Every structure is written in structure tokens, then in C-alpha cells.
Amino acid sequence: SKPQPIAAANWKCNGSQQSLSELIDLFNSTSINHDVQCVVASTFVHLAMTKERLSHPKFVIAAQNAIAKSGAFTGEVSLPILKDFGVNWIVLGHSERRAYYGETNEIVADKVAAAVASGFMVIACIGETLQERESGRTAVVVLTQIAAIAKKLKKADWAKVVIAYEPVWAIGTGKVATPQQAQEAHALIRSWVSSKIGADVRGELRILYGGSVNGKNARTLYQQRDVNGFLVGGASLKPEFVDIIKATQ
Amino acid sequence: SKPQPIAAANWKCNGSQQSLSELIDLFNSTSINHDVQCVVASTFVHLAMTKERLSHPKFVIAAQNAIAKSGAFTGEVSLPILKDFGVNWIVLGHSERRAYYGETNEIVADKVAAAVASGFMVIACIGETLQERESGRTAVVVLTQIAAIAKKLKKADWAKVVIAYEPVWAIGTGKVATPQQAQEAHALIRSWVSSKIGADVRGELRILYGGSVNGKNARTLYQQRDVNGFLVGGASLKPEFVDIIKATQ
Numbered sequence: 001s002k003p004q005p006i007a008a009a010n011w012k013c014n015g016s017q018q019s020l021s022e023l024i025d026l027f028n029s030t031s032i033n034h035d036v037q038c039v040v041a042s043t044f045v046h047l048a049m050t051k052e053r054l055s056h057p058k059f060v061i062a063a064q065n066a067i068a069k070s071g072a073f074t075g076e077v078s079l080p081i082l083k084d085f086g087v088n089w090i091v092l093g094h095s096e097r098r099a100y101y102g103e104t105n106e107i108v109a110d111k112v113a114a115a116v117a118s119g120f121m122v123i124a125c126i127g128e129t130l131q132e133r134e135s136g137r138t139a140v141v142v143l144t145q146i147a148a149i150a151k152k153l154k155k156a157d158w159a160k161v162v163i164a165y166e167p168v169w170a171i172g173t174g175k176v177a178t179p180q181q182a183q184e185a186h187a188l189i190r191s192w193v194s195s196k197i198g199a200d201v202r203g204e205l206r207i208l209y210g211g212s213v214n215g216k217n218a219r220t221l222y223q224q225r226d227v228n229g230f231l232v233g234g235a236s237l238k239p240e241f242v243d244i245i246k247a248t249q
Numbered sequence: 250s251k252p253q254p255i256a257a258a259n260w261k262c263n264g265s266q267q268s269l270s271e272l273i274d275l276f277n278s279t280s281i282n283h284d285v286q287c288v289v290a291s292t293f294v295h296l297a298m299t300k301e302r303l304s305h306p307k308f309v310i311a312a313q314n315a316i317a318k319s320g321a322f323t324g325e326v327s328l329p330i331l332k333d334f335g336v337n338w339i340v341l342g343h344s345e346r347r348a349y350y351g352e353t354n355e356i357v358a359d360k361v362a363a364a365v366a367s368g369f370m371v372i373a374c375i376g377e378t379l380q381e382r383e384s385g386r387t388a389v390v391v392l393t394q395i396a397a398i399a400k401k402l403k404k405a406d407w408a409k410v411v412i413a414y415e416p417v418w419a420i421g422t423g424k425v426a427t428p429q430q431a432q433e434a435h436a437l438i439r440s441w442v443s444s445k446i447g448a449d450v451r452g453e454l455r456i457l458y459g460g461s462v463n464g465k466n467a468r469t470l471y472q473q474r475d476v477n478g479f480l481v482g483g484a485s486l487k488p489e490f491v492d493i494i495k496a497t498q
């Protein structure tokens with residue numbers, strides 16, 4: 001079997017109050033019959049909104065980022081501030097952040113660890129760019145990234161950790177990752193877990209899909225023995241999100 | 250003699266629902282009689298609370314940053330989001346961000362245009378470090394920075410811009426900045442604009458002092474020609490901020 005699937009919504013840096021309530025309404029009024037964990041990753045600015053309005057029992061609000069300690073970080077949100085705000089899930093390492101906000105292996109690793117010790121429930125991202133894929137550096141890349149996170153964790157910590165495999169090489173490159181290609185990649189990760197940490201940890205580990213997800217292709221993906229759910233982008237803004245939930249078969 | 254003063258609270262990376270409300274309530278029950286613009290800068294997370302709690306008329310809220318455009322920039326909060334949020338003020342350019350978050354001149358000046366271009370009032374930050382200062386590169390360094398901002402604005406634009414002179418060289422290095430010290434960087438500013446933009450704008454320009462302000466030295470600082478109010482740090486999460494506000498005549 002598989003663990004408990006997670007269908008996460010990465011709303012990123014989008015929306016308006018209206019657009020969201022609207023969304024959230026649909027969500028709230030959706031019966032999800034099975035065991036799944038729904039997560040909502042909204043803007044800091046819309047954290048209060050969602051928070052006060054998400055009523056469904058299967059859903060969770062989640063920050064899209066953070067910094068370890070409160071202080072003079074003009075512009076930044078720390079872990080404590082979030083905890084307090086009553087937020088216990090986070091998404092760290094997200095593709096757009098490595099690429100554009102120079103959040104390096106160690107940076108991610110260091111926030112991950114911190115999120116964890118504050119009792120956060122973290123979805124950590126990893127994945128290779130087109131270039132690297134092309135020069136068949138996937139496994140160095142993928143593996144390297146994961147151990148970067150590991151180094152910092154204790155065996156008890158993994159219980160808090162969700163890994164999300166971002167095939168950046170397909171994200172905006174007119175490249176279509178197939179289920180086969182996803183599976184081969186989640187497979188690797190798990191191999192690296194089973195071995196480096198434990199075979200116990202590995203089996204309990206949920207490893208989400210980061211590429212482009214949408215209703216049609218949700219079904220086939222998750223059917224893969226190593227895919228434990230989704231890290232949703234775009235459709236997370238529309239109602240297909242519900243369709244993506246249900247693919248959690 | 251002087252354009253309208255501003256008293257801006259930078260909360261930077263700090264807060265709590267409970268401690269912040271305490272403050273707000275103090276702020277709210279303060280008696281101000283003059284013509285001043287008080288400005289609370291909160292964490293994105295605290296926007297809603299501060300937005301619908303701060304009752305005072307001499308007070309408006311600001312965001313400590315943003316990106317000019319909505320989309321896929323995880324972790325990021327854009328102009329439009331805040332615009333719909335009901336936020337019309339924004340701190341941009343900040344030393345902490347220029348120092349640890351990639352903020353180049355080229356970067357801060359686009360940000361700045363975008364906000365103006367959107368109808369925000371802006372607190373674009375500028376200032377030199379101990380490294381410059383010492384190597385005698387102050388005028389070189391602050392006209393360049395100011396110029397890069399100007400490059401994209403239109404003269405009419407400046408009705409929407411406030412400058413805050415941050416004494417980087419004295420911020421956290423063991424050095425102090427006298428008022429005659431401030432005055433000089435202030436006067437350079439006033440100068441350049443006055444000279445490269447038009448003395449119409451110039452005398453209108455509000456130039457804030459972003460160095461260490463407190464209940465004790467606020468008046469002897471406010472007491473200088475080019476000093477139009479402040480961009481306060483530490484004394485901002487504290488009551489003595491009230492003293493700051495009064496210190497503007």
C-alpha cells in the first residue's frame with residue numbers, strides 16, 4: 001500500500017479577496033470521502049482570510065515560506081510569527097525560490113530543520129533544471145539536494161517531513177514529464193531514504209508530485225507506486241483542484 | 250518652512266498578535282494635534298489585524314516590501330495583492346533587504362516605479378555603508394542610488410515619493426551619527442533633486458532619517474533643516490514611539 005496522500009494547493013503569488021472566498025467556498029462545500037490531507041498555501045496577506053474561512057475538515061492552511069528567527073528582516077516572516085498566527089505547515093525549498101531568491105542547499109536545509117524543531121509540518125522541495133536533466137546530472141542533483149536536508153535532521157524528525165519532487169525540467173520548457181519519468185524519480189529518492197535513514201522511514205514517507213498537474217493526468221500519476229500525492233500550482237487556482245483531490249483514489 | 254512630517258514605525262521582522270494589539274491601542278489613544286503622517290509598517294502576516302484595528306486618523310498602514318507583479322514567485326507578495334488588500338503605503342529599498350536579499354539599484358528602482366505607477370505612496374530607502382563612507386564614497390554612493398530611482402520616475406511622480414536616508418555605516422557597526430551628520434546626507438539629497446528635478450519638487454520632498462531614533466534624540470534630529478520625520482526601528486515596537494511622533498513639532 002501507500003501512506004496518506006496529500007493534495008496541496010500552491011496558490012503562490014496570486015489572488016484577490018473575492019477570488020479566494022469563492023474558491024474556498026467551493027472547497028468548504030466539497031465532500032471528500034477518503035483519507036487525504038488537503039493543504040492550502042496562500043499569500044501571507046491572505047493567511048487571515050483563508051484561515052477564518054476554511055471550514056472543511058480535510059483542509060490545512062500553509063505558508064509558502066519563512067525564515068527561522070524573528071528579528072530585523074525587513075520584509076520577511078519568521079517561524080515564530082507564523083506559529084503564533086496559528087500556522088503549523090510550511091512549504092520550504094520551492095523551485096521559484098532557489099531559482100530566483102538564491103535559497104541554496106544549506107539555506108533550505110537550515111530552514112527545514114528550523115521548521116521542524118518549531119513543530120512545523122514541512123513540504124520540502126527538490127528537482128533538477130532542464131540543463132542538468134539534459135546533461136544527465138539528475139541523480140547527483142536530486143540526491144545531493146535531499147541529503148542536504150537530511151544532514152540536519154534526526155530520525156524522529158522525518159515524521160514531520162514531506163518531500164516534493166519538482167521536475168523543474170518540465171516546468172516551462174515545453175517538456176512533458178510522463179508518469180514513468182516521475183516514478184523513476186520518486187523511486188530514486190525513496191531508495192536514498194530506505195538506505196540512508198531507514199526502511200521504515202522510507203515506507204511511511206509521502207513523496208508528492210511537483211510538475212504540472214490537472215484533472216486528466218492526475219489519475220495515472222498517483223497510480224504510481226512512489227507518488228504520494230500532489231504539489232499543485234495553477235489548477236490550485238481553479239476548480240479542477242477538486243478533480244485533483246479525487247484522483248487520490 | 251517644512252513640508253509635512255512622517256513618523257513611520259518599522260516593525261521589520263517582529264510581532265505577536267497580543268503584543269501588537271497592545272501597541273496599536275496605545276497608538277490609537279495618543280493625542281496628536283499637528284499635521285503628521287504616522288505610518289505603521291507590519292509583517293505581511295499582521296496586515297489584517299493592524300488594518301482593521303488601528304483606529305487613529307493620523308495613522309495609516311504600510312507593507313515592508315513587495316514585487317511589482319502577481320504570478321509564480323512563491324513566498325512573494327505583489328503590488329496588486331496589497332493594492333486590493335487596501336494597502337496604499339509601502340516601505341521599499343530597505344538596507345536590510347539590499348544587504349541580504351539581492352536588492353540592487355536596478356531592482357529597487359523598478360520596484361519603486363511600479364508602486365508609483367500603481368498609486369502607492371513609497372518610502373524608498375537609500376544610504377551608504379561603513380565601507381563606502383570610510384573610503385570617502387558617500388556622495389558618489391547616494392546620488393547614484395537616488396539617481397537610479399529617478400531614472401524611471403516622472404517629475405509628477407514625486408508627489409508620490411518619500412525618501413528615507415538610512416545611515417548604514419552607523420547601523421550596527423559601533424559608530425554613531427550626529428545630527429550634523431544626518432543633515433549633510435539629507436542636504437545632499439535635497440540638493441540633487443532640487444538641482445536635477447526642480448526646486449518645486451525638492452522643497453516638497455520629505456526626507457526621512459532611517460538611523461537610530463529614540464524618545465531622547467528625536468527632537469535634536471527633527472530640529473535640522475532637511476530632516477522631515479523618521480524611519481524608526483527599535484523604538485517602534487515600543488511606547489517611546491509616541492515621543493517620536495511628538496518630536497515632529
Ligand SMILES: O=C(CCCP(=O)([O-])[O-])NO
Binds near residue numbers: 259344461462480484
Ligand atoms: O533599519 C533601520 C535602521 C534601524 C536602526 P535601530 O534598530 O538601532 O533603531 N531602519 O529601517
